[PDB]
Amino acid sequence: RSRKESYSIYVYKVLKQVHPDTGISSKAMGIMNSFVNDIFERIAGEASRLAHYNKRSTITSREIQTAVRLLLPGELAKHAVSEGTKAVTKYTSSK
Amino acid sequence: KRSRKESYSIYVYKVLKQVHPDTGISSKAMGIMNSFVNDIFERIAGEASRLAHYNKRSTITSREIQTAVRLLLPGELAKHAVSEGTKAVTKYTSS
Amino acid sequence: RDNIQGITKPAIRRLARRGGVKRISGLIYEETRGVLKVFLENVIRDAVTYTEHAKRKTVTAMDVVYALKRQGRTLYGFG
Amino acid sequence: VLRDNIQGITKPAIRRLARRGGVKRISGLIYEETRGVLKVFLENVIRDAVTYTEHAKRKTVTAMDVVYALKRQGRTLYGFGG
Amino acid sequence: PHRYRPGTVALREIRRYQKSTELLIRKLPFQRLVREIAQDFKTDLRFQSSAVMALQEACEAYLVGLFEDTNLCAIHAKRVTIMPKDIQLARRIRGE
Amino acid sequence: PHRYRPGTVALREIRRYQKSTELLIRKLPFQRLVREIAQDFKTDLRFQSSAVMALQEACEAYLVGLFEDTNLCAIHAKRVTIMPKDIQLARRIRGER
Amino acid sequence: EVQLQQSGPELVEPGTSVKMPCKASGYTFTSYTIQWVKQTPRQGLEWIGYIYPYNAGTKYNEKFKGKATLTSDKSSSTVYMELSSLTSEDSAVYYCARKSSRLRSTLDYWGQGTSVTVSDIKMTQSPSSMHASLGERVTITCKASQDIRSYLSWYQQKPWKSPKTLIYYATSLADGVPSRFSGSGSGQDFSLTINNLESDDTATYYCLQHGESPYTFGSGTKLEIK
Amino acid sequence: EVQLQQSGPELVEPGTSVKMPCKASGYTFTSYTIQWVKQTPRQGLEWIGYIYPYNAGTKYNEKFKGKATLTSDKSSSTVYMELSSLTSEDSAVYYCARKSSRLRSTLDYWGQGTSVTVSDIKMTQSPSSMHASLGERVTITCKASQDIRSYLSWYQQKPWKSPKTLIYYATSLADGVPSRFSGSGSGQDFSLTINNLESDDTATYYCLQHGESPYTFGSGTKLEIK
Amino acid sequence: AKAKSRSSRAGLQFPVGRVHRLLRKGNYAERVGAGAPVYMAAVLEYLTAEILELAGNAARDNKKTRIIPRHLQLAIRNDEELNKLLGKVTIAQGGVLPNIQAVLLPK
Amino acid sequence: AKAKSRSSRAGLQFPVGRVHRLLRKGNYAERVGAGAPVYMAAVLEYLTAEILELAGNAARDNKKTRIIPRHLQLAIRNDEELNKLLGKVTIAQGGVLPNIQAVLLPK
DNA sequence: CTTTATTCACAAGCTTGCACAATCCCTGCTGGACAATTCTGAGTGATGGCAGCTCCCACCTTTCCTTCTTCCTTCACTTAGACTACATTTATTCAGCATCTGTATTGTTGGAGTAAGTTCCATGTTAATACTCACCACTGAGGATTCTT
DNA sequence: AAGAATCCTCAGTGGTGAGTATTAACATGGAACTTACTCCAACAATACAGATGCTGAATAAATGTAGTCTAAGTGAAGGAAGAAGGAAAGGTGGGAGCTGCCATCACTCAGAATTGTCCAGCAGGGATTGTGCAAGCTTGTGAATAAAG
């Protein structure tokens, strides 16, 4: 066979973090995997276009922050920017 | 000392003088033509990139461009564009 | 091969009841069959193009998902 | 500091935009609705253009940023670059 | 006997089919329709079960959304019955 | 004196403005509106002339196309006067609401 | 797949009008123009006009303006032709032909032809008629008056049958046409070459331009086998 | 930009009903819920319910169910609050507050509040009232009866003024709030720290949980300087 | 030194390394700036957590322990920002919102 | 060593070399075969030729000898295919197609 | 004709009994992290200059406010038929089983085809240039329109 | 049926100035050429999963009938929008100055790719439960009919 990867264990870890009594079905896991892949493609494509517009050959967290400000609506974008900034600060402050 | 911009305004004029010898063009219409050629280039190239990524291939060939033309362009437009691309590739791989 | 009559009158009635339609005219069903045929041809043509590019003789769910997507009709839950 | 400039989109301008759209009769409450719709569209496009400008570390909004904003919202505009 | 006035069972059907999530077209006629439509593009090609299932989910969702816009057009025309002109207007505004 | 019936001038205005190509809104009020709207996002911004020009063609094309959809909604309701309910229905079907 | 249904033969007394339908099936009806041509023994094929159902846009020949009007019905997928004031020289076979809005495309599919019976670029074809054996090569020349940028088409017509498209864009093969037929030439000089013949090549061959606004057919070359 | 306009005070006879407007501006009205909080000097602040103008979705507290009715009008961007069968314990200040539909978001912008006069999980705040100098450190505890996923907010209220949002998500600072204030803690133990004092900080500080369906405020601390 | 991962360095659940590999091989840019996968993974984890929390709340109000795609559809369509993000998105076996127009009701 | 650019070898006017460079630098794939810019330049040249010829015909039936964006809009919007390709596209200074609904005409 | 007690049918809630999918556990294995080196691309500064402001003006076209008329919208009735609701008959689908074979996938090999580096020269961009086309002014004919005939 | 003043739009003219097409200067990027490496056709095998067929019980679809209620046509009344004139006010095009900011250039230095190793996290397969689906029973409720005032 051929080892196809997904986000099922990651989405399940997030679900047991925010709801430590609530399970999920296989179909809802497929919906969640499609959602994560679709949003990944949208943010990565917007960041790629942002890097291409400014004659840049790298994608940094500034491009990802601007892309998140573009695709996501208002408070969704604000909280996602806060989460991303917090994670990048924690990653830099701890190797 | 400022750098130079590049466009399709020279080749579009050559195609115009082929299809209409006694016919000029305004600068605004040339801007529309440049935007059109750029838009169709990004559409076909992105479509072909997605086609190569879906099939786990690492190169864009003329088969990917042909399939992208078939998917993007409507019927007789796609038929004649496939005809032109096939004739040009046949003419290019003979000299 | 006909088979557009297999999309029967109460099936279109159920699809309209899910859409919130209370009263349905008698000429709705043929128009709905034509609309469904046009949409199905547009999706299936792109799915078969994606299948033929892969040198395959089988239309997979991935080809249908890519075809749907290209029309701005992204479908979740099939990979 | 500008204030109350949506009233500068006058009633004859909205009537001309309706005539180009093929409209024969226009009600009196159409104009305020059109001002609100044009305002909402303008804040969406201008917000995306200002985001594209601030990513480029510029204080000047260019036409190319407006073109990328319009392309982003599915309203691709020809003849202004790109 | 007992008989409901018109519009009562219709509203009951609206509530019932908006409460549930199961598909409303039978699977075999849709499979035959998909195969015959694909016959014009390919002479002899097979179909995954998931492919037909994804096609059915997408087609039913499209038809439900178009019937929502059709009902909105019918209500805007001061009617409660949907006509083919409402479908044509909704598909014209949608760009189809 | 001499007067035209209602709808006669309104049809010649349709025939006049559909064959012309230029902008229908005055340039300076639209530029002031654009600067007023953009001042709520970033202070001391400075647009180019072509940026305001592109914004004006985009807004006028959007408004004209919405007016055709509004006219279709009005004609569907057996009317010739467009109303705010027609604008709301067109924006509802288009996905803008 | 693509069919252009028509009506039967209409016997018509002079003075009144006649209607011809072109009920179309097998394709998206609004995306292709429907063109009407007429055929007489006296002067052969000539183009009457067309009607684009996408915007119902008509364009007629200069000698058929007023004589012929064209309408379309999108709901029934039909195109109707009206001929008014039928004179004596109006007994003809009237054909409707699908043609895409692309300039390269031609009258690829034709109708059966309604027989109506009543009680500019000059096309020069050098061979009026020729005879051939069962295996030799035939060349047909279609030198034109003005310059057409490869917008020439070659058609084969059996007796009492609709014309069949062979060559479009002066070199490209039509759908289903074998590689025996080969178009060549550009500008004003064009030619059709039949490589090896069969018993089915006994037919009349026409060349049609669509580079200018009035489309003109060829004089017609009759090819008879053995 | 964002403001929530509320009416003046009401002198109501008991047994009647009173309407309360919450006219809103400066933001997209449908994308944010409007919450209603009642404030008495004996029970403190009590969350009543919220209206979502996107789907007109209501949710009420159990002790205000039936007694309070929330409605929305999207044309004038207004939120209406109905109180019927006025009991003598209704002399209170009613605030309407904006809150996004995101779970992390809190009651960020508040209205001025209408003073009406008739003619679960419990937050424990350890200091009821404390005295601090001009440059001391202030630490306020908000021990929770149950577990919340860091869904706690800290508010500051001046006398005869609307509450001001200081801290959301138990650590994040609100818009415009200086970095002297610092929230900390999670789960059931939370704390708010004032770093250095000013004369502005003479206020009452509250903590609100919104991790479960009935939202509960804290008892509040009175902090006065010199 | 025991090879701790980047997600635990950033305090995340979504993989920083897999997101870095997909960004590298996905033909988006010549280089990836190594703080971009941390930001991306944080944004994906936040959106997943918000959707899953709203879906679990919908399942609890529906008195169900498990989340089915109906709960995801009810979570997405009842939120304005989530429905704006996924306006052109079909959720399989999700149904529609219960919504009857006010004119169609009797009296 | 000599002449014969890749456009002249393929019988084109659109630059095969510039299209190859834009395909390489556009971050579409890791490799680009050397038939893809030829096919791509041919398709772009055909589309440019079709739009420019239709716009030249629209200018010719306007007693004009210069293409303005009005002629391009008239060429694009009068075609089923072309309108479909460029259906979500705004042309600056192009106007609209002259049409009035039949119920608005007086009778 | 106006409220109101039966009658009625429907969906909702409660209570077991399973079995299908969900959770978890074991095992390889492959992709991620560590670590040192090399190789850049992108941040600091400093310049030069252009283009975006801001102000002044004088004109005249656009806009706004009144007044009158008309004709379009909205309400109220009437009715005709086309829908809905329902019982009965009928046919079709579903679900499980079994066989079958065409295909999708995995594995290996190697040759064709593409990337990379130098050179250089031919092409494309920019600046300077000379007329062309189309834009107003101005008569001038033709239809279109509202009106008295 | 017809006759007629009356504003509005195309059809030509003539001028000319705005822009477009034409002509050097050069620099940059595309072509020639060679080498190195890796990517994907091309067979070969093999399971597997999509096709086809049967079959007996669910299950919906088809049909015909009765009866309601709704779409649509007609009319009349009223008010809200169009057309027009006269006054006012602001857009526009031109002409400055001023400077703030954008794009260019150079440097270098921190970060990102490279590459080899090694392990630990994740995907696949298999037991293991446990939630919700089904079936049956009771119930509250809304809809529609028959009674009483």
Side-chain angles (χ1 to χ4, degrees), chain A residues 2-94, chain B residues 3-95, chain C, chain D, chain E, chain F, chain G, chain H residues 1-148 150-225, chain I residues 1-106, chain J residues 1 3-107:
Chain A
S2 167
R3 294 183 181 277
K4 31 206 168 50
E5 52 188 35
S6 68
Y7 291 100
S8 311
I9 56 170
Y10 299 133
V11 168
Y12 204 77
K13 277 187 219 125
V14 169
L15 165 76
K16 282 323 163 108
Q17 168 179 283
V18 311
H19 273 292
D21 325 287
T22 282
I24 202 166
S25 67
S26 178
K27 275 82 42 183
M29 197 57 87
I31 301 275
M32 286 320 284
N33 296 4
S34 310
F35 166 74
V36 174
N37 282 321
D38 173 55
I39 294 313
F40 188 93
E41 261 138 35
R42 288 201 241 173
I43 296 183
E46 191 44 55
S48 157
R49 279 191 291 272
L50 275 164
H52 191 89
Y53 293 159
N54 301 118
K55 337 302 280 293
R56 294 250 177 279
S57 78
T58 188
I59 287 187
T60 53
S61 79
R62 208 166 163 272
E63 272 80 44
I64 303 288
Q65 169 160 123
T66 307
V68 159
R69 270 175 186 140
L70 285 162
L71 301 319
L72 303 199
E75 301 285 311
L76 209 44
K78 166 204 177 142
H79 295 335
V81 156
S82 325
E83 278 304 292
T85 320
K86 173 194 197 226
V88 170
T89 303
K90 193 170 157 4
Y91 177 76
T92 279
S93 91
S94 295
Chain B
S3 92
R4 67 182 214 172
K5 205 37 158 47
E6 67 164 38
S7 48
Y8 299 96
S9 97
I10 186 167
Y11 324 106
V12 167
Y13 195 81
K14 272 173 208 168
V15 179
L16 173 63
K17 304 315 276 208
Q18 291 201 300
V19 302
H20 274 297
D22 41 6
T23 290
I25 185 161
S26 73
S27 67
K28 309 271 191 63
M30 197 69 81
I32 300 277
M33 278 336 262
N34 292 5
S35 317
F36 167 74
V37 175
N38 281 316
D39 186 40
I40 296 307
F41 181 87
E42 304 158 4
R43 283 200 231 170
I44 298 180
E47 183 65 13
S49 157
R50 251 173 280 128
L51 272 161
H53 183 69
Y54 294 157
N55 290 281
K56 293 179 179 179
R57 272 181 59 123
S58 90
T59 167
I60 286 179
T61 55
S62 51
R63 180 196 170 77
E64 265 86 12
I65 304 286
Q66 160 146 331
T67 308
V69 161
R70 277 193 200 300
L71 283 159
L72 282 199
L73 267 40
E76 221 82 350
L77 252 191
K79 186 221 186 307
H80 296 326
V82 155
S83 295
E84 289 289 326
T86 309
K87 175 202 35 191
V89 168
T90 298
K91 186 156 166 168
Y92 173 74
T93 74
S94 279
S95 178
Chain C
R1 217 176 148 237
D2 196 276
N3 290 322
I4 198 55
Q5 300 315 108
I7 315 297
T8 60
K9 258 182 40 65
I12 296 148
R13 218 183 293 140
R14 284 191 291 274
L15 290 161
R17 291 304 194 253
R18 189 169 274 170
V21 168
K22 194 196 191 162
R23 223 160 162 274
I24 318 188
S25 150
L27 304 113
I28 279 290
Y29 311 113
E30 218 58 44
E31 173 93 22
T32 312
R33 284 185 189 106
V35 159
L36 171 76
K37 214 198 182 51
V38 166
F39 177 77
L40 250 190
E41 286 163 8
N42 291 350
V43 177
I44 280 186
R45 193 193 314 117
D46 288 350
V48 167
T49 300
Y50 272 116
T51 297
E52 286 188 320
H53 184 78
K55 314 263 198 31
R56 271 188 284 105
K57 288 133 218 93
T58 302
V59 173
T60 62
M62 263 303 117
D63 301 334
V64 177
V65 157
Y66 298 150
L68 281 179
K69 189 158 36 218
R70 270 194 21 81
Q71 285 168 25
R73 314 218 60 114
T74 309
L75 170 79
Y76 283 4
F78 282 92
Chain D
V1 185
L2 320 172
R3 200 167 38 82
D4 166 286
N5 283 115
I6 196 67
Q7 299 307 309
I9 314 298
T10 63
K11 147 183 207 153
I14 304 180
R15 286 178 69 85
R16 287 193 292 274
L17 290 162
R19 292 304 185 248
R20 185 164 283 174
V23 175
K24 198 164 122 148
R25 291 177 64 84
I26 302 154
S27 149
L29 325 163
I30 277 285
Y31 307 112
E32 226 45 64
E33 195 98 355
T34 313
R35 287 193 187 84
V37 164
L38 165 79
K39 186 166 257 274
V40 165
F41 177 78
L42 249 193
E43 324 183 299
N44 292 343
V45 177
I46 282 185
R47 208 208 324 280
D48 280 354
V50 167
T51 301
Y52 271 115
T53 292
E54 293 189 346
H55 185 73
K57 289 155 159 144
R58 280 187 277 102
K59 297 166 179 229
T60 282
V61 179
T62 66
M64 267 327 305
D65 303 339
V66 180
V67 162
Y68 305 143
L70 286 160
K71 183 178 179 180
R72 252 197 49 70
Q73 317 208 155
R75 298 296 299 278
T76 306
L77 171 82
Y78 282 6
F80 275 104
Chain E
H2 181 271
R3 185 182 295 276
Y4 287 107
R5 281 143 43 117
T8 294
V9 192
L11 279 181
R12 233 158 60 204
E13 281 185 38
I14 289 168
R15 261 167 238 131
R16 157 190 321 135
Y17 292 124
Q18 281 184 332
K19 201 179 129 96
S20 63
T21 51
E22 38 71 34
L23 296 178
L24 301 167
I25 306 163
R26 305 263 84 186
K27 304 183 168 0
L28 214 59
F30 198 89
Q31 212 195 57
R32 287 197 308 263
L33 183 60
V34 155
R35 266 155 223 280
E36 148 205 330
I37 286 193
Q39 267 177 357
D40 326 298
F41 319 126
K42 183 68 180 295
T43 84
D44 184 1
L45 82 170
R46 318 152 81 78
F47 267 91
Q48 274 193 357
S49 36
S50 315
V52 190
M53 279 342 303
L55 277 170
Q56 195 159 2
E57 292 263 343
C59 283
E60 287 202 13
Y62 167 78
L63 281 180
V64 163
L66 189 51
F67 272 131
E68 253 146 32
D69 291 345
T70 302
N71 197 30
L72 284 194
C73 292
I75 291 166
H76 184 254
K78 263 129 168 46
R79 285 186 272 99
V80 305
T81 316
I82 56 160
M83 320 252 291
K85 61 160 94 152
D86 313 343
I87 299 194
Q88 293 161 13
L89 181 77
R91 296 196 40 232
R92 194 139 168 212
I93 300 166
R94 265 138 88 87
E96 324 182 9
Chain F
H2 169 272
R3 273 192 48 117
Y4 274 117
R5 291 291 77 92
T8 283
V9 179
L11 260 185
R12 100 155 58 100
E13 256 163 78
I14 291 174
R15 274 183 214 107
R16 162 196 178 177
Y17 288 121
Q18 272 176 3
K19 92 166 307 173
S20 70
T21 78
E22 68 313 349
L23 295 176
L24 299 175
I25 311 171
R26 290 312 109 196
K27 311 287 201 23
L28 191 60
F30 196 87
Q31 149 170 347
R32 287 194 316 245
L33 170 65
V34 154
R35 296 183 187 278
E36 163 179 299
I37 287 192
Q39 104 188 357
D40 289 330
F41 303 133
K42 171 172 178 159
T43 56
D44 279 287
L45 267 178
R46 287 153 41 128
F47 299 69
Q48 313 182 328
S49 67
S50 64
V52 190
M53 263 318 111
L55 277 163
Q56 193 161 355
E57 325 256 2
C59 284
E60 281 196 20
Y62 166 75
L63 279 192
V64 160
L66 188 56
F67 272 134
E68 336 199 305
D69 279 331
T70 302
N71 200 40
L72 289 183
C73 292
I75 291 172
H76 186 250
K78 267 134 163 213
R79 281 187 278 108
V80 296
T81 291
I82 58 161
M83 290 177 183
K85 57 155 92 149
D86 315 346
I87 294 195
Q88 290 158 24
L89 183 78
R91 290 188 85 231
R92 185 182 295 276
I93 298 171
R94 263 147 83 111
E96 284 152 61
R97 262 301 189 157
Chain G
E1 169 136 68
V2 175
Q3 301 259 335
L4 284 193
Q5 273 103 24
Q6 276 189 8
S7 49
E10 295 302 320
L11 177 63
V12 47
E13 292 47 23
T16 174
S17 64
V18 68
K19 197 168 197 178
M20 290 129 306
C22 189
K23 171 69 173 66
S25 64
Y27 66 99
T28 309
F29 172 62
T30 51
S31 42
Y32 298 79
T33 57
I34 299 285
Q35 334 242 321
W36 285 78
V37 321
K38 81 177 264 191
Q39 191 188 202
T40 37
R42 178 189 291 272
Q43 30 189 357
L45 287 160
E46 53 218 315
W47 174 73
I48 291 175
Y50 73 87
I51 186 167
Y52 195 17
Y54 167 68
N55 44 17
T58 59
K59 189 162 106 196
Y60 303 95
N61 201 353
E62 211 62 294
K63 59 173 282 188
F64 288 103
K65 265 194 186 65
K67 192 60 155 206
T69 75
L70 276 156
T71 49
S72 157
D73 183 286
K74 211 186 314 297
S75 63
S76 67
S77 300
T78 326
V79 152
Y80 302 100
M81 206 201 165
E82 292 331 328
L83 293 155
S84 62
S85 301
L86 291 287
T87 65
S88 188
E89 293 177 350
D90 268 17
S91 307
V93 198
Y94 288 87
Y95 291 98
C96 65
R98 196 189 76 159
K99 173 188 175 325
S100 198
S101 43
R102 318 262 57 80
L103 309 152
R104 165 181 317 217
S105 288
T106 188
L107 328 180
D108 47 357
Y109 295 130
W110 293 55
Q112 303 97 357
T114 61
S115 325
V116 161
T117 325
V118 158
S119 300
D120 302 82
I121 297 184
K122 158 94 197 305
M123 224 51 105
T124 303
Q125 296 192 6
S126 37
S128 316
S129 187
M130 51 222 303
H131 297 39
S133 95
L134 265 291
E136 28 197 35
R137 143 166 280 99
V138 199
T139 300
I140 292 181
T141 309
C142 190
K143 218 276 187 178
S145 156
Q146 314 189 6
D147 197 339
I148 39 177
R149 296 154 287 106
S150 298
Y151 283 127
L152 177 63
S153 319
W154 286 98
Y155 297 96
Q156 154 180 277
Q157 197 195 26
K158 306 283 185 67
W160 315 122
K161 269 313 280 152
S162 56
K164 166 201 196 48
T165 312
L166 310 174
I167 295 285
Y168 77 98
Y169 208 45
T171 40
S172 302
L173 276 190
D175 270 15
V177 173
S179 186
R180 309 185 299 119
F181 307 97
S182 98
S184 63
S186 282
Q188 313 207 14
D189 301 11
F190 302 89
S191 36
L192 174 77
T193 295
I194 304 141
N195 201 29
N196 47 85
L197 304 113
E198 310 197 353
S199 64
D200 289 345
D201 291 12
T202 309
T204 318
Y205 294 90
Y206 304 96
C207 45
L208 155 79
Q209 66 96 14
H210 48 286
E212 183 178 2
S213 318
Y215 305 161
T216 63
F217 280 80
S219 302
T221 291
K222 293 179 179 179
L223 185 65
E224 206 304 337
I225 279 292
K226 104 205 192 163
Chain H
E1 268 263 272
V2 178
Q3 34 205 36
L4 294 174
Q5 317 278 355
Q6 258 175 289
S7 49
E10 317 248 347
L11 294 293
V12 202
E13 293 177 350
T16 36
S17 93
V18 47
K19 293 179 179 179
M20 273 141 216
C22 191
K23 170 71 171 67
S25 42
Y27 65 98
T28 297
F29 171 67
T30 52
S31 42
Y32 294 81
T33 73
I34 296 275
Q35 327 276 129
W36 279 86
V37 190
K38 183 169 71 172
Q39 182 184 234
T40 59
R42 194 182 312 278
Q43 300 49 27
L45 297 119
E46 282 140 295
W47 177 75
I48 298 175
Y50 71 89
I51 187 66
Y52 196 20
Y54 177 69
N55 47 14
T58 59
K59 179 181 282 288
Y60 307 91
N61 204 350
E62 217 41 32
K63 59 168 287 185
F64 297 101
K65 184 145 276 305
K67 194 276 192 155
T69 289
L70 270 77
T71 36
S72 156
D73 289 345
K74 311 203 275 157
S75 52
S76 71
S77 302
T78 322
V79 162
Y80 299 96
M81 164 96 179
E82 293 177 350
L83 289 179
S84 60
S85 72
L86 259 72
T87 300
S88 188
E89 293 177 350
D90 280 10
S91 305
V93 194
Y94 291 86
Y95 302 101
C96 61
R98 195 190 74 159
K99 175 187 174 325
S100 198
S101 45
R102 321 261 57 83
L103 309 138
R104 172 177 321 215
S105 284
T106 188
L107 279 66
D108 47 8
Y109 296 105
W110 292 53
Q112 323 97 20
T114 71
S115 210
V116 156
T117 59
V118 163
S119 296
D120 61 339
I121 308 150
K122 293 179 179 179
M123 323 279 87
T124 326
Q125 302 197 8
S126 325
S128 178
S129 64
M130 59 158 51
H131 279 64
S133 72
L134 174 287
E136 205 191 280
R137 177 154 317 274
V138 190
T139 291
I140 301 121
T141 325
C142 191
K143 172 84 206 177
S145 160
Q146 263 156 265
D147 189 18
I148 43 182
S150 296
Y151 285 122
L152 177 63
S153 322
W154 286 98
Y155 301 93
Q156 151 174 277
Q157 195 186 206
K158 311 294 178 63
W160 307 120
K161 296 285 295 316
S162 60
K164 185 190 199 303
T165 311
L166 305 176
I167 293 286
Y168 76 101
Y169 210 44
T171 65
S172 304
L173 287 143
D175 289 345
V177 159
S179 197
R180 327 191 341 258
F181 306 96
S182 95
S184 70
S186 77
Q188 315 206 41
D189 219 56
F190 298 87
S191 49
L192 173 80
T193 307
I194 291 122
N195 218 49
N196 56 71
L197 272 304
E198 313 200 325
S199 64
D200 174 47
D201 289 7
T202 304
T204 318
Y205 297 93
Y206 302 95
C207 47
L208 159 72
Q209 64 98 14
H210 46 101
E212 279 315 298
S213 58
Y215 298 171
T216 323
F217 282 80
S219 311
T221 75
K222 323 228 180 323
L223 181 81
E224 55 297 7
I225 306 305
Chain I
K2 201 57 66 182
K4 77 167 324 203
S5 64
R6 284 198 275 177
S7 273
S8 86
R9 283 201 176 95
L12 302 177
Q13 305 287 335
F14 268 49
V16 179
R18 177 183 296 186
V19 158
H20 198 302
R21 185 244 300 157
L22 294 171
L23 262 181
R24 271 197 339 256
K25 87 187 180 22
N27 297 313
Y28 297 118
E30 193 224 320
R31 303 145 91 79
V32 175
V38 177
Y39 211 114
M40 183 176 282
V43 166
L44 287 186
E45 204 212 348
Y46 163 69
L47 290 174
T48 307
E50 176 90 0
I51 288 197
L52 278 179
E53 190 137 17
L54 293 179
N57 289 347
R60 212 198 35 238
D61 308 337
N62 192 31
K63 302 223 172 353
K64 298 241 162 302
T65 286
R66 203 170 287 148
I67 293 174
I68 60 170
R70 172 61 160 174
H71 304 148
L72 295 165
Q73 174 96 340
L74 288 185
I76 269 46
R77 296 319 165 189
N78 280 341
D79 201 277
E80 160 133 43
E81 279 144 10
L82 282 188
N83 194 33
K84 176 70 217 163
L85 173 66
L86 316 173
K88 293 179 179 179
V89 165
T90 301
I91 279 144
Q93 289 294 282
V96 288
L97 284 180
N99 184 52
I100 311 188
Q101 296 297 129
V103 48
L104 299 191
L105 295 174
Chain J
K4 302 278 334 173
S5 64
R6 271 194 288 182
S7 269
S8 93
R9 202 177 330 248
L12 299 177
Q13 268 96 25
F14 268 47
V16 178
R18 155 174 311 193
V19 161
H20 197 297
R21 181 204 93 226
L22 286 177
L23 272 179
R24 257 186 289 104
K25 296 304 130 37
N27 280 131
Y28 302 114
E30 214 210 34
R31 302 159 88 84
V32 171
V38 183
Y39 211 113
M40 179 67 181
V43 166
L44 289 183
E45 206 213 357
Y46 165 68
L47 288 178
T48 314
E50 181 84 11
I51 290 204
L52 272 182
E53 184 157 25
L54 290 177
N57 289 350
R60 200 231 317 280
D61 324 316
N62 192 31
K63 183 178 179 180
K64 307 262 174 313
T65 310
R66 191 184 283 168
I67 300 163
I68 61 180
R70 173 62 167 173
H71 303 149
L72 294 160
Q73 169 95 3
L74 284 177
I76 284 151
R77 295 317 163 185
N78 277 332
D79 184 1
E80 169 98 23
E81 265 134 24
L82 277 185
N83 199 321
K84 198 161 152 17
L85 177 70
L86 313 158
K88 293 179 179 179
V89 168
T90 302
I91 278 142
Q93 287 295 297
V96 294
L97 231 52
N99 192 31
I100 313 183
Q101 297 297 133
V103 317
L104 300 198
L105 278 35
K107 174 77 142 271

